[PDB]
């Protein structure tokens, strides 16, 4: 009985067939500095059920249509009812056309409108972006429709399943270039009413979703290539970026990635061209618009001269991720936002596969484990987590839709899909994947459709046998939150599962239909030899001889952490794994060498092993040369450093880390020919970066020596930076720490003239490493000056200063003191008080510091705390948990480091 225009979901009575859309951005503002765009559209739709109302989305559009807000016509010889009135309903973002009679099923109608909106600098819908070319401020027009902003650019049935073809036309200044999803139909032609403008028409899109449309007017230039099949590939950027060669790496990898996916998906790339564009400051990162993918510049462009290898890794993975969607997400589209996790989780997994194809020597696939698996496990091991799936009827408003785009959706999505591919086998997974894409091309699906297609492939073969249906298995991993710890007693081979929470005193109140039991694929290795695969059924406890060991035998579960779970053992089997790692580490796969560390520190947090057992698992690192296990140790120990770097625990901690890292430092010293040439592949470059960072930050004299020499050498010849980009962040930081105002002032001058964001970021970060109080305070004083520190870098800089053990009280005092830069930083920018608060309070671990934080909060009465309001409550609760952890752990940890630092 509620009126349909007060419901958030569209009626199903009318479905779109095709749209004409003409947009005209005005890149010169009016007298008051208002920028607008104008548009005209015609939507052709079909009546499925009789209705006397048309409901279509519209947001922030003013209508200038002759008569009512629309004109309505019948297609062919269909009669059309007269319009009664048109109204806009802001809450549900609709244009509502009330008719004097009913539309008729089977008939098609055309609805024409003319409209205009602000071309705002708001990164939503059709919007403007401003950037500098030297003396000059440039302004371009571009789009971001995802999720519910297509309706902010033209009236449309703005739900992803309501697919249609689109004929786009841009009217633009005649010396600019216009781009959209499809190629232009031909040359631009002059606008007859004013030939300073031109008209660019684009070929008709395939049937597609509104959230994937894009159109862009700019001065950008491209580098290009024509693939063997005739697909034109272009990378677009600012003219100066193109001329500097910054588009080349993206161009290099794009062809191979597209080829890999066409093969992987058993489906031709569905469009005639691929454009990718680098936009200055695009806050969303990247967006997979079909045929015209947008990226933040620094994510797509690459400067070999000044960029690190991790930087390069980001380019190729971000590209692989977006290109993945050109089939999965765009060709076959999930019917509703509640299934976003499947689209984003799938892309978040297969980005590693596409990237690996482009860079096959880098072993990129391994990176999903620290990058996504352990990352998301940190938040999925909380009582406040949520299942991957959400009922569709609970996801209605644009705010509810936006909440779907979180860590769980992307990273747990990737993790469980990777698991599924693995227990299926890739070949079988790819077979059902192809079957799904072929059956649903240009249509819409739910996750159940993918499971059904995977089930079809399973049922068509005899080799891979499952303990249940694909759906029943995946239901355990998608309908309930969290994941299990699998615990093995190797004396008996008994194996158990329970819902893993980091906080052992947590009360879980979200109920599960499965009582937090999973069906779990368990690979295992015994004395370095793969064993037969095992499935744990939906039981708390089971037994198998696979997990039963002889006294000199060791067993280890979840090879390469393909399964979304963590593993604990009895202490004896732990000691055996330890012995192995100490005596021949190569017998255990590198990812599992990392797993042992990752898992045991989490288990210690949850009180399932002693903290000393986790520490014991780092003892092998003195002989470890590879990236991942060292990364596991460093990630798991940053909290220890945060908690203890002001205490008597720190001496022995640093001493221990120096001992462990010295042989690695030495190794690279020789391997790199005295640091003159980098290791060859990515993982080894990453290992070297970490080794140097660890050596320097823990006070290894030989690392300090290297940093001073290199920075001294740079200062004596500023135009020839002798420091490879991989090593800059450490070398800069350590040399600044060791030096005084000469190094600091030099780095400041370098910062002030840096042209490249990444180099500027490293300098800003390294400037916070000074051990002079006065330089840190002077630096803090600069953070609020937009002439010296960009406002968008202010909080990040303060946090870097806070990270310095000496800068901790300076930053904290500065923040409390200047808190009333909130009455000048909520309505004129965001700032991010939230991140600032977290950063500056991160160390707090005493009742004394807790009392201070409470007293600061007592500037309540007015001022409040805007967008980090509770980023302050979180700080109080975090500090309490820190006080408690430090109290339980201080003694034990102290004595362990003393005991193990020689």
């Amino acid at each position: 009985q509620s009126k349909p225009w007060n419901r958030y979901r569209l009626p199903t009575t009318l479905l779109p067939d095709s749209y004409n859309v003409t947009l005209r951005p005005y890149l010169t503002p009016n007298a008051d500095g208002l920028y607008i765009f104008k548009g005209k559209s015609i939507v052709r739709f079909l009546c499925q059920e009789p209705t006397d109302v048309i409901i279509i989305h519209s947001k922030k559009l003013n209508y200038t249509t002759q008569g009512h807000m629309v004109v309505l016509r019948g297609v062919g010889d269909s009669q059309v009812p007269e319009i009664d009135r048109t109204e806009l309903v802001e809450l549900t973002e609709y244009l509502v056309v009330h008719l004097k009679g009913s539309l008729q099923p089977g008939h098609m109608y055309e609805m024409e409108s003319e409209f205009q909106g602000e071309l705002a600098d708001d990164l939503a819908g059709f919007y403007r972006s401003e950037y500098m070319e030297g003396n000059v401020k440039k302004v371009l027009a571009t789009t971001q429709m995802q999720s519910t902003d297509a309706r902010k650019s033209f009236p449309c049935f703005d739900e992803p399943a309501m697919k249609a073809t689109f004929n786009i036309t841009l009217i633009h200044p005649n010396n600019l270039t216009a781009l959209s999803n499809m190629p232009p139909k031909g040359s631009s032609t002059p606008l007859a009413e004013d030939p300073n403008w031109s008209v660019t028409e684009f070929e008709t899109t395939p049937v597609m979703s509104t959230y994937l449309l894009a159109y862009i007017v700019s001065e950008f230039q491209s580098v290009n290539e024509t693939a063997q099949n005739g697909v034109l590939i272009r990378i677009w950027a600012r003219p100066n970026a193109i001329a500097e060669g910054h588009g080349m790496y993206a161009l290099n990898v794009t062809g191979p990635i597209l080829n890999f996916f066409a093969n992987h998906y058993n489906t031709s790339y569905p469009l005639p061209k691929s454009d990718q564009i680098a936009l200055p400051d695009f806050n969303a990162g990247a967006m997979e618009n079909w045929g015209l993918v947008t990226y933040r510049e620094n994510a797509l462009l690459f400067d070999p001269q000044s960029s690190s290898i991790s930087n390069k890794e980001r380019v190729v993975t971000v590209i692989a991720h977006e290109l993945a969607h050109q089939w999965f997400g765009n060709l076959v589209t999930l019917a509703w936002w509640n299934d976003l996790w499947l689209n984003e989780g799938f892309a978040s997994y297969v980005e590693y596969l596409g990237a690996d194809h482009a860079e096959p020597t880098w072993n990129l696939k391994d990176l999903i484990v620290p990058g996504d698996v352990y990352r998301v496990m940190a938040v999925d091991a909380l009582a406040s987590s949520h299942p991957l799936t959400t009922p569709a009827e609970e996801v209605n408003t644009p705010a509810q839709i936006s909440e779907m785009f979180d860590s769980i959706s992307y990273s747990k999505g990737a993790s469980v899909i990777r698991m599924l591919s693995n227990f299926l086998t890739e070949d079988l997974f790819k077979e059902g994947l192809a079957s799904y894409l072929h059956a649903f091309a240009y249509q819409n699906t739910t996750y159940l459709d993918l499971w059904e297609h995977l089930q079809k492939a399973v049922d068509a073969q005899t080799s891979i046998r499952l303990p249940d249906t694909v759906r029943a298995i995946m239901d355990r991993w998608t309908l309930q939150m969290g994941f299990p710890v699998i615990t093995v007693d190797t004396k008996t081979g008994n194996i158990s599962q329970k819902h893993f929470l980091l906080d052992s005193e947590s009360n879980v109140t979200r109920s599960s239909a499965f009582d937090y039991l999973w069906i779990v694929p368990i690979s295992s290795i015994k004395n370095g030899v793969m064993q037969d695969h095992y499935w744990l059924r939906d039981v708390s406890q089971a037994q198998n001889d696979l997990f039963k060991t002889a006294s000199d035998d060791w067993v280890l579960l979840n090879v390469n952490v393909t399964g979304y779970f963590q593993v604990n053992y009895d202490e004896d089997n732990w000691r055996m794994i330890q012995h192995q790692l100490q005596t021949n580490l190569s017998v255990i796969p590198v990812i599992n060498r990392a797993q042992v560390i990752y898992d045991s520190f989490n288990l210690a947090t949850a009180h399932m092993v002693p903290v000393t057992l986790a520490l014991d698992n780092t003892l092998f690192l003195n002989g470890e040369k590879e990236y991942m296990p060292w990364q596991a140790a460093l990630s798991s120990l940053s909290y220890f450093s945060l908690m203890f770097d002001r205490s008597e625990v720190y001496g022995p901690m640093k001493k221990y880390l120096r001992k462990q890292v010295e042989p690695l430092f030495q190794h690279f010293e020789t391997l790199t020919k005295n640091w003159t040439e980098r290791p060859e592949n990515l993982m080894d470059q990453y290992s070297e970066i970490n080794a140097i960072s660890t050596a320097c930050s823990n006070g290894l004299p030989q690392c300090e020596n290297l940093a001073k020499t290199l920075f001294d050498q740079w200062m004596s010849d500023p135009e020839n930076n002798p420091i490879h980009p991989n090593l800059r962040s450490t070398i800069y930081c350590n040399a600044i720490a060791q030096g005084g105002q000469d190094q600091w002032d030099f780095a400041w001058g370098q910062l002030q003239q840096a042209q490249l964001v990444n180099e500027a970021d490293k300098l800003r970060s390294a400037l916070a490493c000074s051990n002079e109080v006065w330089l840190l305070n002077r630096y803090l004083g600069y953070t609020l000056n937009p002439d010296l520190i960009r406002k968008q870098d202010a909080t990040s800089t303060i946090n870097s200063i806070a990270s310095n053990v000496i800068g901790q009280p300076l930053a904290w005092d500065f923040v409390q003191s200047n808190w009333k830069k909130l009455f000048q930083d909520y309505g004129g920018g965001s700032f991010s008080f939230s991140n600032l608060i977290q950063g500056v309070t991160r160390r707090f671990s005493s009742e004394f510091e807790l009392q201070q934080l409470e007293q600061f909060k007592k500037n309540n009465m007015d001022v409040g705390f805007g967008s980090g309001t509770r980023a302050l409550e979180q700080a109080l609760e975090k500090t309490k948990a820190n006080i408690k952890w430090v109290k339980e752990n201080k003694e034990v940890v102290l004595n362990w480091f003393i005991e193990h630092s020689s």
Binding site: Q146, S147, N283, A284, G285, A286, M287, E288, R296, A299, V318, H321, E322, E344, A347, S348, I401, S402, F405, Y410
Partner: peptide, 6 residues
């Protein structure tokens, strides 16, 4: 979308 999405 990838990065900061809504």
């Amino acid at each position: 979308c990838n990065g900061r999405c809504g």
